[PDB]
Design an enzyme around this catalytic site. Structure first.
Site, mmCIF file in Angstrom:
data_model
loop_
_atom_site.group_PDB
_atom_site.id
_atom_site.type_symbol
_atom_site.label_atom_id
_atom_site.label_comp_id
_atom_site.label_asym_id
_atom_site.label_seq_id
_atom_site.Cartn_x
_atom_site.Cartn_y
_atom_site.Cartn_z
ATOM 1 C CG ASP A 26 21.445 2.924 18.016
ATOM 2 O OD1 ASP A 26 20.821 3.863 18.556
ATOM 3 O OD2 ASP A 26 21.934 3.011 16.869
ATOM 4 C CG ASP A 35 34.943 -0.802 17.622
ATOM 5 O OD1 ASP A 35 35.644 -0.333 18.544
ATOM 6 O OD2 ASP A 35 34.131 -1.732 17.796
HETATM 7 N N1 LIG Z 1 12.782 -3.083 8.585
HETATM 8 C C1 LIG Z 1 12.203 -1.889 8.438
HETATM 9 N N2 LIG Z 1 10.898 -1.843 8.087
HETATM 10 C C2 LIG Z 1 10.312 -0.650 7.939
HETATM 11 N N3 LIG Z 1 10.841 0.568 8.092
HETATM 12 C C3 LIG Z 1 12.133 0.492 8.439
HETATM 13 C C4 LIG Z 1 12.873 -0.663 8.629
HETATM 14 N N4 LIG Z 1 14.178 -0.357 8.984
HETATM 15 C C5 LIG Z 1 14.196 0.954 9.001
HETATM 16 N N5 LIG Z 1 12.996 1.533 8.681
HETATM 17 C C6 LIG Z 1 12.701 2.963 8.610
HETATM 18 O O1 LIG Z 1 13.864 3.638 8.184
HETATM 19 C C7 LIG Z 1 13.872 4.975 8.726
HETATM 20 C C8 LIG Z 1 15.246 5.286 9.262
HETATM 21 O O2 LIG Z 1 15.689 4.178 10.076
HETATM 22 P P1 LIG Z 1 17.234 3.891 10.284
HETATM 23 O O3 LIG Z 1 17.894 3.377 9.001
HETATM 24 O O4 LIG Z 1 17.391 2.971 11.434
HETATM 25 O O5 LIG Z 1 17.887 5.313 10.569
HETATM 26 P P2 LIG Z 1 17.474 6.159 11.816
HETATM 27 O O6 LIG Z 1 16.737 5.303 12.792
HETATM 28 O O7 LIG Z 1 16.545 7.328 11.376
HETATM 29 N N6 LIG Z 1 18.848 6.791 12.543
HETATM 30 P P3 LIG Z 1 19.853 5.529 13.055
HETATM 31 O O8 LIG Z 1 19.033 4.506 13.942
HETATM 32 O O9 LIG Z 1 21.075 6.111 13.869
HETATM 33 O O10 LIG Z 1 20.357 4.816 11.843
HETATM 34 C C9 LIG Z 1 12.734 5.052 9.748
HETATM 35 O O11 LIG Z 1 11.662 5.850 9.260
HETATM 36 C C10 LIG Z 1 12.318 3.589 9.944
HETATM 37 O O12 LIG Z 1 10.910 3.471 10.099
#
Ligand SMILES: Nc1ncnc2c1ncn2[C@@H]1O[C@H](COP(=O)(O)OP(=O)(O)NP(=O)(O)O)[C@@H](O)[C@H]1O
Ligand SMILES: Nc1ncnc2c1ncn2[C@@H]1O[C@H](COP(=O)(O)OP(=O)(O)NP(=O)(O)O)[C@@H](O)[C@H]1O
Ligand SMILES: O=C(NOC[C@H](O)CO)c1ccc(F)c(F)c1Nc1ccc(I)cc1F
Ligand SMILES: [Mg+2]
Lengths: 308, 276
Positions: A148, A175
Site C-alpha cells: 500500500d 483480509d
Molecule cells: N503518523 C502520522 N503522522 C502524521 N500524519 C499522519 C500520520 N498517519 C497518518 N497521517 C495523516 O493522516 C491522513 C490520512 O492518512 P491515512 O489514515 O493513512 O488515510 P489515507 O492515507 O488518506 N487513505 P488510506 O492510506 O487508504 O488509509 C493524511 O493526511 C496523513 O498525513
C-alpha cells in the site's frame, strides 16, 4: 545494512525512550487536532510528555479474530530502522483499534504536495533512496512486502528524516478490513489488478507512479493534455482499465534529467519480470547521484510549510 | 403504513434480540404466535419522494406469496422511523451450509436446491420484482425447504464518506454492468440492477454449490472490480478448475459478459432438469 552512526544513535534514543513510557491503557491519551481521514489525531500522552500519534479504525467483528490481530501487530516492536516510523504500541479499546506511532512534524507527502504544488527533482532523489532502503530492510529482515505505497503514507519531520507508515504487517487485518476500500485514485500495479501472484515488484510500480505525481503536481493517469502539461470526471473502473490496457505514465522530457526519466521508466514497466528489483535500483545512476549529493532537507521542509 | 392496512391481523409485535447490522438498518428477532424478523430503518432523506417510492415498493411486496420467497408480512412507517417485518427463517444460511465439513453435497442435492431458488426467483420476476441483492447469505435452508430473503430492499433510500467500502462476498455476486458504474459518491440505488444481473448472481450461487467457496479468493477490492467488469476474471476461473460440461454450461450462460445473452429463470429450470 549500511547503518550510519548518527542514525543508530537516534534509534537507540527512541528505543530506550520506548520503555520509559512503557505500557498503557486508554485514558493516558488526549486529543489535539485533526491530522486527517482516509482517522489519525494528534495526541498528548500524560505519563511521558512526548506527544505521539494515535490512529483509530472502526471494526465491529468477532473478538477471536480481534485477538489474532493484536498479536500479529506486536511484531512491529521488532521493526526498527531509520526509514520506518517509530512504533510505540498497539491495543484494543472500545472495538476501535489504535496504533501509537511517532509524530511527524510535516505530515504526509500528499499534504506536502498540495502546499508545495510541485516537488523538485533534486529532492525526490532523496525520498526515492529512503524507500528502496526501507523496502529491502522490510523484505530482508522480516520477509514482508508493503502492499500500500502512496504519498499519504510517506511522512517527513523537521528533524530531516524520511520514513514510511501503514505497511502491511498483519495478514488478518488485510483480509478483514484493508481490502474492502477503494479510493478515488489507484496506486496498484497492473499485475495485482489482474490477480496473479505479486511480489515486491508490485511495490516498485507504486513508488514509480507516486514519483510522477509528486514531480508534476498532478495525479498522472489519465495523462494530462498536451497543452495542460506545459502550463503546469472519470469512474473508477475506467481508471483501472487504463492502467491495465494503456501505456504507463512518463516524466516530461524537457524538464528532468535522463537519470530521473530512466529511473521512473524502469519502475513503471508493466511486466514485473522486466521491472527493476531493489538490488538493481540501488545501483542505478539516479540513485548513485542523489545518495552522494548535498541537500539540506530540514530547510526546504520548514520554508515550504512554515515550521521551525 | 400503520400496519393495520395489512391482511395479517395484528394486535402487538415484540422486539427480541438483535441478529446483525448492515447498510440497511438493524435486523431483530421478534414474536408476532410465531417468530418473525424485524428490520429497523431510518430515512435521512426526509424527502416526500423517498417515502412515496418506499410506499410503492412495500405495497407491491404485499402482493407476493410463494413457498420459495420469504413471506412479506407488514411494514409500518412513522417517519423518519420505519420497520419491515418478514417471516423468521429457522435453519442455516446456505452460505454457512455449503461451508460445513459435515455437509454432504452431490450432483443431485445441488440441482434440487438450484431449482427451488429458480422457482422463487421466477415468481419474483413474473411480478416484476427484481431482487437486486441475491447472494448465498440471503437464502435459507432448513431440512428440505429453501427460502429467499432480503429481496427488493436495495430500492430504498435510507441512511447507510468520499471513499467506497465493498465487501468481497458481495462483489463476487455482482455482474460487470454494475461494477463499471461503481464510483465514490454514487449510491446503490443508482446502480444498474436488473433481471439479468439477478441471473448473474445466480451464476455465483451455483458456483458456490459446486465449490463451497468464492470464485475469487479474498483480495483488494480494486482487483476484484477490474476482474469482474472486464469479464476476464470469470473467464479465467472457468479455465482454472473444471467441474462438468453440463454443470459448467449453466455457469457460462449465467456469467455471460453481455447481459442480454443471459438466460431467463424459466429457461434455467429446463437446463437444470436435463442434468445427471
Ligand atoms: N503518523 C502520522 N503522522 C502524521 N500524519 C499522519 C500520520 N498517519 C497518518 N497521517 C495523516 O493522516 C491522513 C490520512 O492518512 P491515512 O489514515 O493513512 O488515510 P489515507 O492515507 O488518506 N487513505 P488510506 O492510506 O487508504 O488509509 C493524511 O493526511 C496523513 O498525513
Ligand atoms: N427474514 C430473516 N430471517 C432470518 N434471518 C434473517 C432474515 N433477514 C435477515 N436475516 C439475518 O440478519 C442478519 C443481517 O441481515 P442483513 O441486514 O441482510 O445483512 P447482510 O445480508 O449480511 N448484508 P446487508 O444486506 O448489507 O446488511 C444476517 O445474519 C441475516 O442472515
Ligand atoms: O495503517 C494501515 N492501513 O491504513 C489504512 C487505514 O487503516 C484505513 O482507514 C495498516 C494496514 C495493514 C497493516 F498490517 C498495518 F499494520 C497497518 N497499520 C500500521 C502498520 C505499521 C505502522 I509503523 C503503522 C501503522 F499504522
Ligand atoms: Mg440485504
Amino acid at each position: 545494512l549500511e547503518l550510519d552512526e548518527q542514525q543508530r544513535k537516534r534509534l537507540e534514543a527512541f528505543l530506550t525512550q520506548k520503555q520509559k513510557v512503557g505500557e498503557l491503557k486508554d485514558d493516558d491519551f488526549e486529543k489535539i487536532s485533526e491530522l486527517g481521514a482516509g482517522v489519525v489525531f494528534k495526541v498528548s500522552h500524560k505519563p511521558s510528555g512526548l506527544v505521539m500519534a494515535r490512529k483509530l479504525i472502526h471494526l465491529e467483528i468477532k473478538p477471536a479474530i480481534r485477538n489474532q490481530i493484536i498479536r500479529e501487530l506486536q511484531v512491529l516492536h521488532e521493526c526498527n530502522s531509520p526509514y520506518i516510523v517509530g512504533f510505540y504500541g498497539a491495543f484494543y479499546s472500545d472495538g476501535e483499534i489504535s496504533i501509537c506511532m511517532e509524530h511527524m512534524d510535516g505530515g504526509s507527502l500528499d499534504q506536502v504536495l498540495k502546499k508545495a504544488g510541485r516537488i523538485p527533482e533534486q529532492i525526490l532523489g532523496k525520498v526515492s533512496i529512503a524507500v528502496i532502503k526501507g523496502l529491502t530492510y522490510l523484505r530482508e529482515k522480516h520477509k514482508i512486502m508493503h502492499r500500500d505505497v502512496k504519498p499519504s503514507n510517506i511522512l517527513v519531520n523537521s528533524r530531516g528524516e524520511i520514513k514510511l507508515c501503514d505497511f502491511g504487517v498483519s495478514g488478518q487485518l488485510i483480509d478483514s478490513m484493508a481490502n474492502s476500500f477503494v479510493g478515488t485514485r489507484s496506486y496498484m500495479s497492473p499485475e495485482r489488478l489482474q490477480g496473479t501472484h505479486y511480489s515486491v515488484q508490485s511495490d516498485i510500480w507504486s513508488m514509480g507512479l507516486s514519483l510522477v505525481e509528486m514531480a508534476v503536481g498532478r495525479y498522472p493517469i489519465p495523462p494530462p493534455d498536451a497543452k495542460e502539461l506545459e502550463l503546469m470526471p472519470m469512474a473508477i473502473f475506467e481508471l483501472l482499465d487504463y492502467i491495465v490496457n494503456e501505456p504507463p505514465p512518463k516524466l516530461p522530457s524537457a524538464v528532468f534529467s535522463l537519470e530521473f526519466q530512466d529511473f521512473v521508466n524502469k519502475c513503471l514497466i508493466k511486466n514485473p519480470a522486466e521491472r527493476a528489483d531493489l538490488k538493481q535500483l540501488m545501483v542505478h545512476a539516479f540513485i548513485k547521484r542523489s545518495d552522494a549529493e548535498e541537500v539540506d532537507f530540514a530547510g526546504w521542509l520548514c520554508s515550504t510549510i512554515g515550521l521551525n | 403504513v400503520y400496519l393495520q392496512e395489512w391482511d395479517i391481523p395484528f394486535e402487538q409485535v415484540e422486539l427480541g434480540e438483535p441478529i446483525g447490522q448492515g447498510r440497511w438498518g438493524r435486523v431483530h428477532r421478534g414474536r408476532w404466535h410465531g417468530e418473525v424478523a424485524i428490520r429497523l430503518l431510518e430515512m435521512d432523506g426526509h424527502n416526500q419522494d423517498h417515502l412515496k417510492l418506499f410506499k410503492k415498493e412495500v405495497m407491491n411486496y404485499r402482493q407476493t406469496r410463494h413457498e420459495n420467497v420469504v413471506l412479506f408480512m407488514g411494514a409500518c412507517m412513522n417517519p423518519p422511523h420505519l420497520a419491515i417485518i418478514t417471516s423468521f427463517c429457522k435453519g442455516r444460511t446456505l452460505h454457512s451450509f455449503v461451508r460445513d465439513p459435515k455437509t454432504s453435497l452431490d450432483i443431485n442435492k445441488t440441482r434440487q436446491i438450484a431449482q427451488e431458488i429458480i422457482k422463487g426467483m421466477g415468481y419474483l420476476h413474473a411480478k416484476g420484482i427484481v431482487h437486486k441483492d441475491l447472494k448465498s447469505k440471503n437464502v435459507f435452508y432448513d431440512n428440505g425447504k429453501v427460502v429467499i430473503t432480503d429481496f427488493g430492499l436495495f430500492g430504498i433510500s435510507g441512511v447507510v464518506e468520499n471513499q467506497l467500502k465493498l465487501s468481497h462476498d458481495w462483489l463476487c455476486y455482482l455482474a460487470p454492468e454494475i461494477v463499471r458504474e461503481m464510483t465514490p459518491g454514487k449510491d446503490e440505488d443508482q446502480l444498474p440492477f436488473s433481471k439479468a444481473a439477478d441471473v448473474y448472481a445466480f451464476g455465483t450461487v451455483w458456483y458456490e454449490l459446486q465449490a463451497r467457496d468464492w470464485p475469487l479468493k479474498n483480495q483488494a477490492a480494486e482487483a476484484s472490480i477490474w476482474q469482474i467488469g472486464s469479464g476476464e476474471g470469470m473467464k479465467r476461473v472457468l479455465t482454472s478448475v473444471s467441474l462438468g460440461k453440463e454443470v459448467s454450461e449453466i455457469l457460462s450462460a449465467c456469467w455471460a459478459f453481455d447481459l442480454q445473452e443471459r438466460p431467463s429463470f424459466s429457461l434455467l429450470m429446463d437446463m437444470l432438469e436435463k442434468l445427471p
